Design a protein around this ligand. Structure first.
Ligand code: ADN
Ligand code: ADN
Ligand code: CTN
Ligand code: CTN
Ligand code: K
Ligand code: K
Lengths: 331, 330
């Protein structure tokens, strides 16, 4: 039985810089609402100069997912590259403090640690503006082969296709994982990210490099360039062994071959900030999965964690997910 | 026309915030509810034991300046950060709020001050502060035209810990009074008062300070008494105006023989008390520089403080001016 890690995640190591804004701010600054907008250093300086007083919190989609698995009680690890600077030190502290194995060594102080200016509108939607900085350095040299070998599931971001060499690391992970009888998982990350890497993502799924795919409605529609969600569901199920597809307030559906398991979203008092919802859905699902739970229960765990994170500021729940899971009888 | 309503001067700090259980404070010998000074080695040790955290610009006076700006007053700030990422954060947040902030970093070492703030289930906050670049603040950082052009210059008792900051404050007092302005201070923390009791009383009695902010604990510590009534009578004798806060019991404003009692506002829950006194000073000084009555100054203070304790972060993220309009205070 004894495997060192339940879930290894791999992603862009990012610190979030968070501010609430009005709707007009997104229009004036040509920020695509609800999306991840890549920006260069000049634009990062420009947007920051226009941003209100902010809060900082460790982010990165996969980073959040790893933290969420640890909070739930699972054994997690993380690969992601920061710089040797104060933001890097924050990132390192926060993920390690949650009890995630994190050992990726910074390569120097420049480029500096990635940051994402995240603007949260009154509806709770989040629009991210990301300077990748030190994330561009993540490569095959950062694969801790023993960790991939000893993790039940290695999960990675579609976002990793933006930096130049991260994809090589992921192909190395896929090889090591499958050689050791483990599983690979990916998230489609963002609908524009899917627009950029559609062919490569489909090839990952169809070649069997990815066993479990996470998508939201928008990403699924984008993957097949369709407006027909039923078509998207049918096609994604044909392309990967297990698909977990989130539908915001309408919950989730888990697909396996011809099987579909629908799960309801939880009751929200108020949607504060949706940042991290998809990441924490993956935390809940992968925690359940690596505990041998039913696909329906994995979905329920995902929706529980996602529901909690959207009721706070910050992409990583500050409360105990394991305690919430116990109260909810998901255990 | 005066350029600024309120200039504040303080230790420029970024907060690092985590919730902890009661035992964590005992285990780490952290004095609860207090500002605990720490060296670089202890800062690393405590950080190593701290859970996942959130960062937000802090500094008592920095928070007060931000609150005045939020309410709609014209604010400025003197405080020293380093040329590093935390310094960049601090500089951004205070300037983005519309506060004049022009103090120049002197280098990257010491690095920007940070305070690890541990919030217990009761909402109390226990701060652990490595002063870093704050030790460099001195007379060279006094923008004399700013002091000359500010209705009130307000400063922290906390400034007596770093070595040269008191010299800057004495320069401020001279320029302020020469230009007919008023000087204000907060006693900051009861242990800070324990450390600098004599000096603080001398500031008040010499007339270098006109308006004093204290909480109950600081007022008792100032006179080393258990008698709150004695503390009120004595503080009124030592300074022209005293604003004394009593947590959930509101505040009392003293001027000579006059006393104005003000109630705390109704709140949904105490999330994190960090910044309550700072934002009381924000509301009070905003009111004061708008020509409002001392009681209305108190009410504005209790409104701003009541708002800040219902959120994580020592600086209100919501509009204080809108809240003041809604509360019918403006
Ligand atoms: N390009 C990116 N790659 C990975 N994660 C990102 C990117 N941009 C923003 N994020 C993260 O997405 C999280 C929300 O899913 C935020 O915590 C933020 O840090
Ligand atoms: N030594 C200090 N000097 C000034 N401000 C401080 C000190 N220690 C903590 N603080 C600030 O006190 C604020 C709460 O009053 C916090 O935001 C924190 O940054
Ligand atoms: N407005 C929203 C948005 C999201 N969610 C929860 O987060 C998951 C992924 O979006 C969704 O599957 C759902 O669990 C929600 O409950 N309400
Ligand atoms: N538990 C608490 C603590 C503080 N406060 C408000 O903050 C001011 C300074 O403590 C106090 O004067 C008060 O207005 C509060 O309302 N409740
Ligand atoms: K959130
Ligand atoms: K607070």
């Amino acid at each position: 039985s004894m495997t060192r890690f339940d879930v290894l995640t791999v992603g862009n190591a990012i610190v979030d810089i968070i501010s609430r804004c009005n709707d007009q701010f997104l229009i004036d600054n040509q920020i695509t609402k609800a999306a991840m907008n890549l920006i260069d250093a000049e634009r990062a300086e420009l947007l920051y100069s226009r941003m209100g007083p902010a809060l900082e919190a460790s982010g990165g989609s996969a980073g959040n997912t790893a933290a969420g698995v640890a909070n739930l009680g699972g054994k997690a690890a993380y690969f992601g590259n920061v710089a040797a600077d104060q933001l890097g030190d924050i990132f390192t502290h926060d993920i390690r403090a949650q009890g995630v194995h994190y050992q990726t060594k910074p390569k120097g102080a420049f480029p500096p640690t990635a940051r994402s200016m995240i603007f949260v509108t009154e509806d709770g939607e989040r629009s991210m503006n990301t300077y990748l900085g030190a994330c561009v350095e993540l490569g095959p040299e950062d694969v801790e082969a023993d960790v991939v070998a000893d993790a039940k599931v290695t999960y990675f971001e579609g976002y990793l296709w933006d930096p130049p060499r991260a994809k090589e690391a992921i192909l190395d992970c896929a090889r090591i994982a499958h050689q050791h009888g483990r599983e690979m998982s990916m998230t489609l990350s963002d609908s524009f990210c899917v627009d950029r890497y559609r062919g490569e993502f489909l090839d990952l799924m169809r070649s069997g490099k990815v066993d479990i795919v996470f998508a939201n409605r928008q990403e699924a529609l984008s993957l097949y360039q369709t407006d027909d969600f039923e078509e998207a569901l049918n096609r994604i199920a044909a392309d990967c062994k297990i698909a977990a597809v989130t539908m915001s307030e309408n919950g989730a559906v888990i697909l396996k071959g011809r099987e579909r398991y629908y799960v309801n979203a939880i009751r929200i008092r108020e949607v504060v900030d949706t940042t991290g919802a998809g990441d924490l859905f993956a935390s809940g699902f992968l925690y359940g999965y690596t505990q041998g739970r039913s696909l329906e229960d994995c979905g329920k765990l995902g929706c529980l964690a996602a529901g909690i994170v959207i009721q706070q500021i910050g992409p990583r729940p500050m409360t105990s997910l394991s305690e919430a899971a116990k109260q909810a009888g998901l255990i």
